[PDB]
Every structure is written in C-alpha cells, then in structure tokens.
Write a protein that binds this ligand. Structure first.
Ligand SMILES: *Cc1cc2c(cc1C)nc1c(=O)[nH]c(=O)nc-1n2C[C@H](O)[C@H](O)[C@H](O)COP(=O)(O)OP(=O)(O)OC[C@H]1O[C@@H](n2cnc3c(N)ncnc32)[C@H](O)[C@@H]1O
Ligand SMILES: C/C=C/CC/C=C/CC/C=C/CCCCCCC(=O)OC[C@H](COP(=O)(O)OCCN)OC(=O)CCCCCCC/C=C/C/C=C/CCC
Ligand code: HEM
Ligand SMILES: CCC/C(C)=C/CC1=C(C)C(=O)C(N)=C(OC)C1=O
Ligand code: SF4
Ligand code: F3S
Ligand code: FES
Lengths: 613, 153, 249, 129
C-alpha cells in the first residue's frame, strides 16, 4: 500500500518513557532543550512500574554507611566484568539521585527520625566486604518501581517535553555513522513519523519475552537493541541474563528480593534452610546468580517442592503480621491472586525466572553509544546515547545487583542530560535528514503487514521462547548450547514464512507484535551464540562444562610469581555480537574490561578476587 | 467560565466527535449495583416529587376540576383498601427514602462512611428503614379504621 | 471438556462506516490460563489476530488492560475467568470512552486532566536540588497510603455516571483522588492554589456521591473518601501543617 | 516514498503554560456548603409536617421545598442538558428552563395553598380513602 510520513525536528529525542527515559526527558527539559519523547505505551505502563524492592543509595538512614562500600559491593556482584569507572559514577551519584527523588515528590517509607527507610537486599555489605549485612536499599514499601516511575512521569509534565505516546520505534536515523533521529509508527492513526534531532537516546528497556518464562512485561521485546543492531552497532554481554531467584512458579510474577532482606527465607522439600549451605555468610541474601543456581540444584537433586517436586518455597509466614503488611503489602496481594497463598500462614511457591538483562548497547561512562575495534580503541557514535536496561555501560558486569537497576536508570538518565547540556552548543543546528531517510524501515512494515506466509507470528515467537529456555537456561553446556544455536538460526529462517492477518494501520496489535518478534529474534540469536562460545562460568553465565572463572591471572593463589595469560586465552572480556539483520549472521569479538576508576584519587580500583558469598 | 482544562476538554470532545469514534456502551452494559441504583433512586424520587409538586400546583390552577372534587372523582370509583393503601405507600416512600438517603449522601460529602461495607450497610439500612416508615404510616391508620369499624366497645 | 464463550465488543475504524458489533468466541478452559487476559491472548493467538486490546505487566500493576468484564470495570490480567460455563461472559471497553479500535479507548482526556493537577512537588522556598531529604514523619507519610497506590487504570472514572455526562468539565474520581494525594502530602506547599484550581461548580463538586468509583477499583483504593475529603477543604475543614524538622534532620 | 509534509506537536495539555493568564478565583465552595446545611435544616421539618399541620406549615413546605428543588433541578439539568448533545443554544435554554421550573413551582404551590386545601390537607384527604 501507501503511507503518510510526518517530519519533526527536536534538539534531543528519547526512545523510552521508563525510569531512565523520563529522567533524561526531564533533565534536558529543565536545562532547556526541545525534547521529544517517543514510547510504544503510556509512560506509566512501562516496566519500571513493576519494580519492587527499592533503590540503593548510601543515605545511611538506617545505620552509618559509606558510598564506597556500595561501589565495593557493586564491583563484586559484577564478577569483575563491570567497568569500575561506570560503577564508580553510579555509586557516587546514587546518594544525590535518590535524594532528588525524595525532593521530586517520591514518597519513600519513613524512619522515626523521618528520613528515608532502608531495607537489606540481595548481596550487599558494610566495610568493603568485611563488615555486616547492608541496609542501603531505599523504598516506597513494596512498590518502588511503580511510585518512582509515577513521580518521574508527573515531574516530566513540569518541563515541556512533547510526548509521542503509543508510537512504535522502527529504526534509528543514520547518516554515515551519525545519529540524526528516529522513525516510529503512530498506532492511533497509521501515520509514520520521522523525527530529526541532534541527539537520540535509546532507553527502551530489556528483552525478557525472549524466554518462554520471565518476570518482565509483555512489552519487553528489546526493540532498542534491535534498533542498535539494525543501525550497525554491535551489542555487548548479551549472554548474561539475570535469573531472579523468586518468580511465582506457575505464572512467574515476581516476589521481591525485599521479602528476603526483611526476614524471609528459602525452604526445600526437607524443610531445610538450604541457603545456609550454599552461602554460609550471606545465607538467603546471596547474589541472585548464586541464590538461583542454589535453588536449581536442590531441584535437580530431588529436594524440589510441590506436586511435581520442581519449585521451592519462599517462606515469610514466621514474620509479624504488621511488618508483612507495612513492608511487603503488594506481594501479599499478588501471592494470593496468582498462587492462592496467604503469606502469614503458608509459603509462596517460587522458582528462578528470567528477569533482567545486564547486556545491551555498549556505552562509555558518559552513556554515549560505542562501536569497538581491536586496533583503534573504541569509537564514540555521534548523536547517540543509550541508558537504562537496554544499555551496557556495564555497571552490572555479569550479574546485576538487587536495587541497582532503578539506580542505573535514574543516574545514567540524569547523566544523559548533564552530558548533553555540557556539550550541545546552541550553534550546531538540527541535522537535516538524508534522501531516502528511513525508507527500508517502512518497507519492512509493509511486507510484515501484508505478510502472507504459513507460520503465524504467534507460533514463531513461542518456539523461540520455548527453545531459548531449554538451551540458554540457568545452567548451560556446550553440546546443548551448540545444539541450540542451530535451532535458533533455523528460526531466523522461518521469519520468511511469517504470516500475519490484521492488515490495518490504525492500531495493529498483530503487526506491532510481529515487528517485536523480529526484534526479539535478533536479541535472542545473539544472546544464545555468545552464551555458547563463552567457555567459562562467571556471574549468571554457568557452563557445567567450564565451571571455572577464567581470568588473566588465577586469583585463587597469591598472584606474586605468575604470568599474565594473554587476552585471547582468558575470558575477562565483554562479548560483542555484530549481526546482519538481512541474513541473521553473527560474528563475535571481545572488548577489554575497564579497570580504572574515575578518580584514582577519589576511590581505589578493586582488583579481581574469588567470588564467594 | 471554564478552567484551562475544561476548555482543552471541550476541544477534545469536538476532536473525538470529528473522528466519528463510537462511545463505549455504559448504562446498558454496566452491572446494576447498590451503588448507582440507590443514587439512581435518589435522583428519581427527588425529581418525581418535584414533578408532582409542579403538575400538582400549576395543574390545579390552570384547570377547573379542583382537588376536593378530585379526591372523590376517585373515591366514587370503589377500589380495595390494599390497592388504595399501596398507592399511599408509593406516595409515602419517595419521601421516606429521599430524606433518609439525603442524610446518607451528606455524610458521604463529609467523607463519612465511604468504605464498601459502610456503603452497603447504609444502602440497606436507609433503604429498608424508609420502607418500614412508609409501611408504618400507611398500615397504622388503616389499623384504627378497622379497630373502630368493628371495635370492642 | 469445558468450553467458555466470550462476547467481545468489536470495531474497525478502517472499514467504511462500520458499527460496533458483538463477537462470540469459544475458549477451551483447560488450555487457557486462569485470568481473562489469558483467554484474551489465547483467542488472538489461535482464532483471530485482529482482536485488539492493551496489555503489559500481566500482574495488574501497569493499568493497561483495564476494561469492562461482566458489567464491571476491572483489570483483565487479574480478573478470574467465571469458571461456570452455562454463563456467557462479555468484555466491553471502559464505559463512555471514545473507542480507537476494539477494546482500546482513546485515553488522552483522562491523561490531560491528570496533567492539569500538576502532579509534582512544589515548595514556597526553592530547594537546592539533591542536597538533603525533606522531613516527613512516618505518621505524615501514611496519609498517602491508599493514595500513591493508584495505577491510573481509569476504571473508577469510567464507572462514574457524572464523568460519563461531563468528562470534559468534571475531573472524575481518578484525577481527584490524585489531586488529594498532593494536597495532603505534608511536604507540598500548594494546598491553597491546588484547591483553587478546582473551586468551580464542576471540576470537583459534580461528584454526585454515586459510589461506583470505590466499589469498582481493582486496587481496593477509595477515591470517593478522597473526593469527599476534597469537598471539606473547599468549604470548612483544614490541611494540617508540617511538624517542623527536629534539628539533626 | 519519504517525500511528505511536516506535522505539528500532538494535542497535549501543558499545565504551566495554560496556567498563565487564567488565575481566576470564583468559588462554588461557599454555595455547596449552604445547600447541604439547608438540606440538613430540612431534616427535622419533614417529620414535623407529618404531625403539625394547617396553613402555616403548608407555606414553609412550599417555601423551603421550592428553594431546595431549585438548587436540585439545576444540577440534574447541568447533567442531562449538556451542550455536547443538545448544541450550544438549545442547552442554554435548558439552563433557563430551570428557573422557569423553580418559578412556576412556587406560583403553583402558592396558588394551591391559597385557593385549594393546602399541601397538608391534601395529604390528609388522599390518606382518608
Ligand atoms: C522486571 C522487573 C524488574 C525490576 C523489578 C521488578 C520486575 C518485575 N524490581 C526492581 C527493584 O525493585 N529495584 C531495582 O533496582 N530494579 C528492579 N527491576 C529492574 C528494573 O526496575 C527495570 O528492569 C528497569 O528499571 C527498567 O527501566 P528502563 O527505563 O530501563 O526501561 P523500561 O522501564 O522497561 O521502559 C522501556 C520504555 O521503552 C519504550 N519502548 C520500548 N520499545 C519501544 C519501541 N519499539 N518504540 C518506542 N518505545 C519503546 C517503552 O514503551 C517503555 O517506556
Ligand atoms: C410518586 C411521587 C408522589 C409524591 C408526591 C409528593 C410531594 C412531596 C411532599 C413533601 C413533604 C411531605 C411531608 C408532609 C407529609 O407527609 O404530610 C403528613 C401526611 C399525614 O397525613 P395525616 O392527615 O396525619 O393522615 C391521614 C390518615 N392517615 O402524610 C403522609 O401520610 C405521608 C407521611 C410522610 C412520611 C415521612 C418520612 C419521614 C422520614 C423520617 C426522618 C428522620 C430523622 C429525624
Ligand atoms: C426532606 C429532607 C431532604 C433532604 C435532607 C434532602 C437532601 C438532598 C441532597 C443531599 C441532595 C443532593 C443530591 C445529589 O446531588 O446527588 C438532594 C437532591 C435533590 N432533592 Fe432532596 N432532600 C430532601 C427532600 C427533598 C424533597 C421532598 C424533594 C422533592 C421535591 C427533593 C428534591 C430533590 C431533587 C429534585 C434533587 C436533585 C439532585 C440529584 O438527584 O442529583 N428533596 N436532596
Ligand atoms: C438519562 C439516563 C438517566 C440515568 C438514570 C442515568 C444514570 C445516573 C445514575 C444512575 C445516578 O445515580 C446519578 N447520580 C446520575 O447523575 C450524576 C446519572 O446520570
Ligand atoms: S482509583 Fe483505582 S480504578 Fe481509579 S485509576 Fe486509581 S487504581 Fe484505577
Ligand atoms: S462514582 Fe462518581 S459520583 Fe463521585 S462517588 Fe465516585 S466519583
Ligand atoms: S497488564 Fe498491567 S494491569 Fe493488566
């Protein structure tokens, strides 16, 4: 058919209306740029609003705390795949960022002295690891993502950003390696909108829906990563899918790690607190990569709970009625709706669930998207920034910290506007669009929209979800993985036999979901092959066939009197997957993990150690 | 005088009218509930009385046929005391209810008794209470017009 | 094997002068999840990809999947399917909204009305942004419990006949409840000019106390109590003031 | 092709900008208060009219009922006589209709109290049959 195109011109455009997105939107807004926000749903419906346990910052409202311990705990949880400057930036500016939120309106739960309340969480500690169990996690009780997001969304109305709601992003606008805008679909009426801008910010969130089961929204299809791949950017660390310890067994709703850091624990079919075994020190407050494998073993070895002996129990019922209600009200109600459970009397049936993506579009500490060559360092991509979960500045290495993603969004969002305000001179005029501007993007829509094949979008997605789950699981092995990479790459073939039905333009659910299957595949393929070729076990990545963590040195011995293993033989490196969308062919490459902090004078880089919780 | 949103909102309506979009089904499909049917009732009673007080006053002016001659242009139509006293009920009940409920609704306006249990106790208490008082006022004076038609003395 | 039939409201804006119709779908209850959304995603995946509705979280926290199921505005995702199959269940969109297509309402008026209340935090003495937290006592903050929880799902508004007749002039339950969340947040310095924004005969006073808003709210929130609390401030009773930050804060 | 027009910002409410030259403070607050006190004042009067009858109650039933019903039909009319569905001028008529209704109400009652049996005797006589 034929399509109606609408050009706009803005200083900066943000793809995404979540935690990160909205903070970039408001920061640029307040510092006076003409800002367009593009988002496939109403901002409040974004996934951030599902978030629960809270947000880490060393307010030390509960007991004395130093921001540096949080940097410590961050660098650890990241299994030294995290870039210690990014984790530097993140954890310094946390105290401010979270205080802002309090100032913006965000109604955190309160201590008697009347400061922000904090609970304890998955995998944190006072004194550079030695001290105690940390209390850094700030929260609006049970529902912190929600309340955070709302506060941000409200606040963004005070800063004249122009909101393009339910517009679906198709591609970034590339002029010879520069980013000049976005092209999106406007669901409400059929119209196609090219946006020109000096800066784009891709802040589009994760890709859980790639797996048959996850805690994420139906709305997490990694469209942003798709937009990166598609504009010739390689994505990093895709292989590190966070498995959250406690998804409700049947549906996979998330019971927050907060319920643990408040008192609750895991139990096996012998009624044993088996987390005392897998983590003598941290117990049920070990990192999710650990706590999860811990659960997954207990299952494998017959200690599984239930009718089929295949989940475990999170138990909170021992806790006081009052505390359960004031500190975890929103899970009390979702445990009841979905798994018939009264949390004062019975345990919640739980099982690890695909949850978070440390992986994403590469970016330096400044949150500016980057391509990388072996010989010529890492090239900035002009005009492009990316932040929140779709990004990889890698503040998260190989394993995210509980309550650090609401932070990594808020902070690096803020770090987008700050970094643009700084370097966007009011001389550099809005780029013009090139001829042919985003034509092959509408050409895809058209063919996807009239797609006549004999495999319905609904079916392709399912088997990609169902396969990705069996092969790129919690524990992985090379003979299943390479098996997997095969099936997967047959699916990127099946995309040619794609059938759709709804042939309309005004609100096409069938069509957008097909665009999303396209995007999901790119995400999933790259994931699985990077997962396959990494012969080691670090953070969330667990090869049963390469159980060790392979670094330049062996950090188990004293170090003094060892040769550095050369780059190519060890694995302490980010995994870059380049893909051709047309063909679906992936090639790997690797990028060195930045170890320097931001101010060698302000804070001391933390050299790798053995990861025990 | 419309607030800036009230203005925006009208243009919104005009927009949405121009786009020919249907309006989603409402009173046809929404489930009869004690919330909106009692409110519904409070409207109707309230109006029906007012409507009578008009056609009553004005109608008995603008017309010959006055109330005294009419109060027995119908007594002369031999109709059984139940049918008659049922009509009185139907006259009495609006008044009982609308008053009773009126005190209820003012409470609401002070944010008082606004929870689903309190909504529903009142919906019933006010409702039933009013239908008692309307039965009291109609059966009792038909009690004495039998207690004295065939009286003990 | 047990078969539940649904009646889904349908409309194609793309078709020349098409009218809303009512479509019947059969769903094998033993090959479907427990909630309505699950039937809804089933019948679009297997029978008819043209069936259109909004959805995200699948745990009833985003608000997207709001709609009218068996007479009530509620969230699909956490609405249990009527297990009884002699009963035929009907899905309709949010009452009184302009429909975009099928179960998808034009949501914007409600969003703008939301915008109108300025749902952000203002103070009289401008603050040096990230520098210290405001003092709020625990007691003070719990004034917000029952109020921050709102998901902007719009069932309350979409159920209130006042807002059915006046969505343009009356602000409706969802928006007011929210306005109130900001006039009792002890850290906000605008009770005065907030209440002033909704002083006229319509924006707040058009609540005819009907009650639907509260009875329906899928989150068990009570916007009416709030509206009624708003009426009080617009007339008699007062907004308590801040217990001062005790030195150390 | 990508050869088409430049479009504008989508319809969107900007609560600061529209806030500018639109500051007015004309409060319906003080009116809504009274008409509830008035309804609450009427509470004892209704049961009084069941007991104490005659020619003076008849007059303040008429009086107080006229004024309550006045503030009453006015709200029911704002509701069902909205300009969206009646057009702008047929709707203004229904507003003015309201007064005519409040005013014929009294005329008609006054009359009935002055020439026929009165409200309260009217009640008696229907209750006698
Ligand atoms: C899944 C999850 C994550 C989570 C959590 C609970 C759940 C169920 N609880 C957390 C917690 O208690 N503390 C914490 O630190 N993190 C927690 N998380 C992780 C975290 O909250 C989120 O994963 C993260 O905050 C996500 O925020 P982000 O801004 O990065 O991305 P988003 O909120 O998912 O929003 C994405 C936006 O992008 C727009 N979008 C997506 N695709 C497009 C296209 N195609 N075109 C236009 N716009 C697009 C979306 O519409 C959305 O606004
Ligand atoms: C369809 C709509 C038809 C309605 C038309 C009505 C116009 C409204 C009238 C409003 C004023 C009514 C009050 C006076 C009154 O009822 O007369 C007493 C008379 C007694 O005669 P009678 O001459 O004494 O009897 C003759 C022989 N039976 O009237 C009655 O018999 C009816 C009594 C009314 C019930 C009162 C409800 C009170 C609520 C309790 C309040 C609580 C808190 C304090
Ligand atoms: C006797 C004591 C009464 C009390 C305490 C009372 C109370 C109230 C209240 C609080 C309202 C506001 C309704 C709303 O906005 O939803 C109302 C409305 C109304 N009243 Fe009364 N009322 C009384 C008697 C009457 C009587 C006898 C009549 C009959 C003429 C009447 C006619 C009306 C009408 C027509 C409304 C229209 C508002 C609506 O339904 O939305 N009232 N009353
Ligand atoms: C024209 C249809 C009349 C009718 C009973 C509508 C529903 C309605 C009901 C049912 C009410 O209770 C009420 N208070 C209204 O005004 C705000 C209403 O409009
Ligand atoms: S008050 Fe309840 S029904 Fe209304 S938007 Fe809020 S959560 Fe939804
Ligand atoms: S239904 Fe509407 S009338 Fe008020 S009580 Fe709720 S907002
Ligand atoms: S999908 Fe989030 S509320 Fe139904």
């Amino acid at each position: 058919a034929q399509y109606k195109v609408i050009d706009h011109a803005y200083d900066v455009v943000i793809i995404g209306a979540g935690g990160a997105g909205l903070r970039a939107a408001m920061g640029l807004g307040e510092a006076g740029f003409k800002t367009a926000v593009v988002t496939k749903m109403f901002p409040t419906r974004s996934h951030t609003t599902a978030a629960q346990g809270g947000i880490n910052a060393a307010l030390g409202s509960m007991n004395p705390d130093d921001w540096k311990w949080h940097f410590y705990d961050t660098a650890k949880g990241s299994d030294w795949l995290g870039d210690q400057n990014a984790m530097h930036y993140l954890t310094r500016n946390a105290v401010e960022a979270v205080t802002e939120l309090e100032n913006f309106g965000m109604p955190f739960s309160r201590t008697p002295e009347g400061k922000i309340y904090q609970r304890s969480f998955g995998g944190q500690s006072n004194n550079y690891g030695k001290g105690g169990v940390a209390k850094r996690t700030c929260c609006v009780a049970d529902r912190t993502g929600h309340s955070m997001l709302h506060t941000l969304y409200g606040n963004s109305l005070r800063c004249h950003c122009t909101f393009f709601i339910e517009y679906f992003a198709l591609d970034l606008l590339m002029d010879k390696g520069r980013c000049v805008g976005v092209i999106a679909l406007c669901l409400e009426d059929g119209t196609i909108h090219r946006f020109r801008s000096k800066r784009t910010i891709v802040a589009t969130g994760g890709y859980g829906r790639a797996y048959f089961s996850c805690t994420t929204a139906h709305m997490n299809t990694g469209d942003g990563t798709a937009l990166a791949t598609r504009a010739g950017i390689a994505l990093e660390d895709l292989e590190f899918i966070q498995f959250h310890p406690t998804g409700i067994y049947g549906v996979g709703c998330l019971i927050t790690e907060g319920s643990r850091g408040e008192g609750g624990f895991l139990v096996n079919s012998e009624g044993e607190r088996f987390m005392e075994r897998y983590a003598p020190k941290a117990k049920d407050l070990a990192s999710r990569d650990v706590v999860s494998r811990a659960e997954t073993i207990e299952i494998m070895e017959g200690r599984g709970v239930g009718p089929e002996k295949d989940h475990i129990y999170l138990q909170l019922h021992h806790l006081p009625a009052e505390q359960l209600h004031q500190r975890l009200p929103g899970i009390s109600e979702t445990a009841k709706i979905f798994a018939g459970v009264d949390v004062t009397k019975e345990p919640i049936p739980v099982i690890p669930t695909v949850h978070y993506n440390m992986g994403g579009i590469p970016t330096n500490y400044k949150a500016q998207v980057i391509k990388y060559t072996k010989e010529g360092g890492d090239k900035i991509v002009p005009g492009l920034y990316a932040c929140g979960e779709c990004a990889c500045h890698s503040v998260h290495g190989a394993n995210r910290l509980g309550a650090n993603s609401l932070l990594d969004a808020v902070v690096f969002g803020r770090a987008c506007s700050i970094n643009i305000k700084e370097e966007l001179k009011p001389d550099e005029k809005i780029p013009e669009l090139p001829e042919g501007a985003g034509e092959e993007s509408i050409a895809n829509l058209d063919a996807v929209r009239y797609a006549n094949g004999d495999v319905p979008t609904a079916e392709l997605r399912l088997t990609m979800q169902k396969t990705m789950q069996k092969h790129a699981g919690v524990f992985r092995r090379g003979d299943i993985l390479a098996e997997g990479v095969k099936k997967m790459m047959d699916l990127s073939k099946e995309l040619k036999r794609l059938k759709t039905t709804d042939r309309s333009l005004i609100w096409n659910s069938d069509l957008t979901e097909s665009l999303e299957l396209q995007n999901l595949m790119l995400n999933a393929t790259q994931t699985i092959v990077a997962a396959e070729n990494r012969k080691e076990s670090r953070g969330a990545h667990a090869r049963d066939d390469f159980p060790k963590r392979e670094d330049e040195y062996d950090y188990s011995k004293p170090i003094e009197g060892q040769t550095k293993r050369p780059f190519e033989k060890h694995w302490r490196k980010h995994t870059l997957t380049k893909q051709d969308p047309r063909t679906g062919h992936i090639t790997l490459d690797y990028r060195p993990v930045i170890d320097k902090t931001l101010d060698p004078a302000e804070v001391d880089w933390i050299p790798p150690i053995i990861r025990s919780y | 005088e419309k607030t800036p949103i009230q203005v925006w909102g009208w243009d919104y309506l005009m927009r949405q009218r121009a786009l020919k979009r249907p309006i989603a089904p409402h009173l046809t499909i929404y489930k009869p509930q004690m919330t909106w049917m009692v409110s519904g009732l409070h409207r109707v009673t309230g109006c029906a009385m007012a409507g009578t007080l008009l056609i009553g006053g004005v109608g008995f002016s603008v017309l010959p046929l006055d109330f005294t001659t009419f109060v027995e242009f119908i007594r002369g139509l031999g109709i059984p005391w139940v049918i008659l006293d049922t009509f009185k009920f139907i006259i009495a009940f609006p008044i009982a209810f609308h008053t009773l409920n009126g005190i209820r609704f003012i409470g609401f306006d002070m944010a008082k008794g606004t929870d689903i249990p309190s909504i529903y106790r009142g919906a019933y208490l006010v409702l039933g209470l009013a239908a008692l008082i309307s039965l009291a006022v109609v059966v009792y004076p038909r009690w004495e017009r039998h207690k004295k038609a065939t009286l003990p003395t | 094997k047990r078969i539940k039939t649904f009646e889904i409201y349908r409309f194609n804006p793309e078709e020349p002068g098409a009218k809303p119709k009512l479509q019947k779908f059969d769903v094998d209850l033993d090959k479907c999840g427990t909630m309505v959304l699950d039937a809804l995603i089933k019948i679009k995946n297997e029978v008819d990809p043209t069936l259109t509705f909004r959805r995200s979280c699948r745990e009833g926290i985003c608000g997207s999947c709001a709609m009218n199921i068996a007479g009530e505005n509620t969230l699909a995702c956490i609405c249990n399917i009527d297990q009884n199959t002699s009963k035929t269940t009907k899905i309709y969109p949010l009452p009184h909204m302009f429909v975009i297509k099928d179960l998808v309402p034009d949501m914007n008026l409600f969003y703008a009305q939301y915008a109108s209340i300025q749902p952000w935090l203002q103070k009289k003495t401008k603050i040096n942004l990230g520098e210290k937290q405001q003092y709020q006592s625990i007691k003070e903050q719990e004034k917000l419990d029952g109020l921050y929880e709102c998901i902007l799902c719009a069932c309350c508004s979409a159920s209130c006949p006042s807002y059915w007749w006046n969505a343009d002039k009356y602000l409706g339950p969802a928006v007011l409840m929210q306005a109130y969340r900001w006039i009792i947040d002890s850290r906000d310095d605008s009770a005065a000019e907030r209440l002033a924004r909704m002083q006229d005969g319509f924006s707040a006073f058009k609540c005819h106390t009907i009650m639907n808003c509260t009875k329906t709210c899928p989150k068990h929130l009570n916007p009416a109590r709030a509206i009624g609390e708003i009426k009080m401030l617009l007339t008699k009773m007062k907004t308590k003031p801040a217990p001062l930050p005790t030195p150390a804060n | 092709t990508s050869a088409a027009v430049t479009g504008a910002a989508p319809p969107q409410f900007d609560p600061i900008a529209a806030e500018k030259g639109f500051k007015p403070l004309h409060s319906h607050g003080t009116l809504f208060k009274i008409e509830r006190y008035f309804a609450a004042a009427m509470v004892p009067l209704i049961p009084a009219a069941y007991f104490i009858h005659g020619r003076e109650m008849d007059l303040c039933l008429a009086l107080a009922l006229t004024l309550h019903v006045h503030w009453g039909v006015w709200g029911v009319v704002n509701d069902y006589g909205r300009p969206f569905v009646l057009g702008d001028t047929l709707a203004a008529a229904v507003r003015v209709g309201a007064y005519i209704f409040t005013a014929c109400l009294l005329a008609g009652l006054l009359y009935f109290n002055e020439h026929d049996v009165g409200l309260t005797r009217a009640f008696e006589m229907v209750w006698e049959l």
